[PDB]
Amino acid sequence: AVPPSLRLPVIEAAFPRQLHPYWPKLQETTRTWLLEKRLMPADKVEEYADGLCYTDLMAGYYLGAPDEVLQAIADYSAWFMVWDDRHDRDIVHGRAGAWRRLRGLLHTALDSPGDHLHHEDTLVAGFADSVRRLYAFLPATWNARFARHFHTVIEAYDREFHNRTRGIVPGVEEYLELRRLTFAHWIWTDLLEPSSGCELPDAVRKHPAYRRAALLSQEFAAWYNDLCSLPKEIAGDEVHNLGISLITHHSLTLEEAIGEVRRRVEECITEFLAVERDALRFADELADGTVRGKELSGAVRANVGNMRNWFSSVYWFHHESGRYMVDSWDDRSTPPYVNN
Template structure:
């Protein structure tokens, strides 16, 4: 069992599964020994309460049916993913991030079901409502669509931690994510497989690279100025951590997405546009993922040297250096958290589903056009 502590900010050594004392078996095609050995996983000590509270929040906001929450919520491991990433975050910040993350997965499932069941009007209404709720979350807390109301609730909480300038940046980044999901909707509806470079650019948006990076700042308790965030050393470390996560997700999702006639996966783009076999595409994905890990280790050192250089003898310089070190440390944590999440979560256990194209934890009828 995981050791628990009541003292916030300490790190809880984590076994790689929240329900068993041993690590899950990782298929050889997905195994990354460097992550298992050089990127030890830890969990925020608030994780046990986080799991309970997010499960309760999903029920209260009606984001998943009660039977689905009871049967699948814990096994989907959404809270484990966030608790392994934003270490050192105040409990309230981590709770807001975890609820938002759970919402994001539910939104992703709704988007998928709207495509599968041919509901473009439902998707259009949702897309426009999310754009509006992002600008005025308080006015949408009681929206008739639980997905919009839940989004408003989570965004309003996230907006309470840092200044308005951070809120505006988060909103700008998420508006772009919504539009990227709309482009994916059109591509999937029309059967268009984007080219490799087009896909890589779009994936940075559909995976919400800059959203998860933005959330490092409230976790560190400090908004980073543009000169710090856009510093090449900091930005490269942030990008590599997110690219690893997105591409490893593509590798693990490939069977599920082929079964579901998906068109948005780096492996699928490589097969269609580079003429690769499935085996060659998997090998290329693994090569790119491995390069992310290797290059991150170099970028991490440069980002930490950048943090050291921020200490100029002033209180502000010290504050920024501490915040950057926290953010870069958590970028490293993202590697192990993402890796183990994909082997713990029921989201990727396609072979155990009755229908490989229909996840058992989704509600096909939610707010859709019957």
């Protein structure tokens, strides 16, 4: 039962959930990784990790991925959530120096992860392990694209740090541009490719239908997170949220901003259904009769299939995950799973 303010009947009726068969092993293996990389305290791992549903989120998204690819993605995605938590905590505690140093180390570790596998900062060491593993699946040109994209994500996190320190709420257009980076749209899009076992040529992944289907899938995920994470984020003095920019710059009430965010999320779905037809037509066209063609066709089709799976995985994740259950916290400003 999804709250009426958050319910999307089109997702429930037309985007049936999928789950990767490796998910049972994935859940425990990522929990063990969080424990052994010291990315969460042992008692917080035991009490909260499974309930945060991070592995479920990936296992409902990258269908068809090799077990080892899914494992590295899930470890990275759990790392990403812990990094969001650390970033938030550095902000709340005014640890500008610790954040700046961390920011620099992630930039460096991103380009040479193997050199950082045993760094003193467990968050940097965890990052490097997952990234080194992700760099092992596809050619160096894919690794360099992942790094280029994540360098941009790190700097968007830095911009968020400056905004919240200075109490600046981005304008709507400014936020929509920033949100494609803080949510890491293009990282999740990159990671479709090791999941289907094929680095896509630029001509293929920059095709207008592939690009637009990829964009809309991520816009939905980020803006649906905004809709669902708004209570926790208002309680935690987070300023980055489409609803908050609407209240601040467009003078909407809370109920009207929630309504406008809802409508924008709903439009993402029906825009995606239109372009999905074009992206799958393009997949069919790539099967020109040659071996390379059949391979590229299959990879594009699998990737567009997972762009669709992202809709249902993110939807149900926000109603299942303990990450957003702010009403159950004694201190609504400090989630119990964060290192405070």
